Structure formats: structure tokens, C-alpha cells
Amino acid sequence: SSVQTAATSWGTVPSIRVYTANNGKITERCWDGKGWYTGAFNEPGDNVSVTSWLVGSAIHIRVYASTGTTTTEWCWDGNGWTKGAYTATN
Ligand SMILES: OC[C@@]1(O)OC[C@@H](O)[C@@H](O)[C@@H]1O
Ligand SMILES: OC[C@@]1(O)OC[C@@H](O)[C@@H](O)[C@@H]1O
């Protein structure tokens, strides 16, 4: 039905990342001050949340993608999206 989004931002320009879960696929749109464009993130999920932090000038992003009761963490640390160590509790 209705897509579900999550958003994060950093800096002062700023940079913004908006993740949209649509029909089981999460994609990413990006802003760094000069126009929206499509990001590299593509992962399965019906629900999405996100957080990010800076270490100096380097952004680190964590996206939590959920299907059913399984949540997978995806990490951006400058070098492509890698699977994180996040696991659920009992
Ligand atoms: O410069 C765009 C980009 O590299 O920014 C960091 C992450 O949002 C990536 O998915 C995205 O493609
Ligand atoms: O560098 C990746 C990592 O260690 O970053 C911190 C947390 O997001 C962890 O789950 C994740 O595996």
C-alpha cells in the first residue's frame, strides 16, 4: 500500500539520505546540496530505519531493514554497503 521511509542527514549543507521501502525493496535517494540522485543502497525489506554519525569528515550510516521478524543491518563506512553484526534478541 503506502511506502515507508526513513531519513538521516549530516553536516550543514547538508547531506540527506532518504530510504524508501516499496513492495519489499528498499532504495535510497541522496542530496548533498546540488540535486537529488539515486544512491547505491538496494536491499530487501518492508520496513526501514536509519541512523548515522560523523567521525571527523567521514560519514557512517547504519540502515535496519526488516522482513517478517528478521532485521538486517547494512553499513556504509565509505566503501560500499556491507552487512553488519546486528542481531535481534530472544
Ligand atoms: O555519494 C553517494 C553515496 O555514495 O553516499 C553514501 C551512501 O549514501 C551511498 O549509498 C551513496 O551512493
Ligand atoms: O563496522 C561495522 C560495525 O561493527 O559497525 C558498528 C555496528 O553497526 C556493528 O553492528 C557493525 O558490524
Numbering used by the authors: 1 to 90
Task: Reproduce passages from the article.
Anionic calixarenes are useful mediators of protein assembly. Symmetric and chemically uniform, the macrocycle acts as molecular glue by masking the protein, simplifying the surface features, and providing a homogenous scaffold for controlled oligomerization and crystallization. Motivated by modular crystal synthesis, we demonstrated the possibility of interchangeable modules in protein – calixarene frameworks by swapping supramolecular synthons.
The Gly33 carbonyl group is within hydrogen bond distance of four phenols, while Val13 forms CH−π interactions with a single phenolphosphonate. Structural differences in the interchangeable linkers result in different relative orientations of the protein nodes in the two structures, yielding different crystal symmetries.
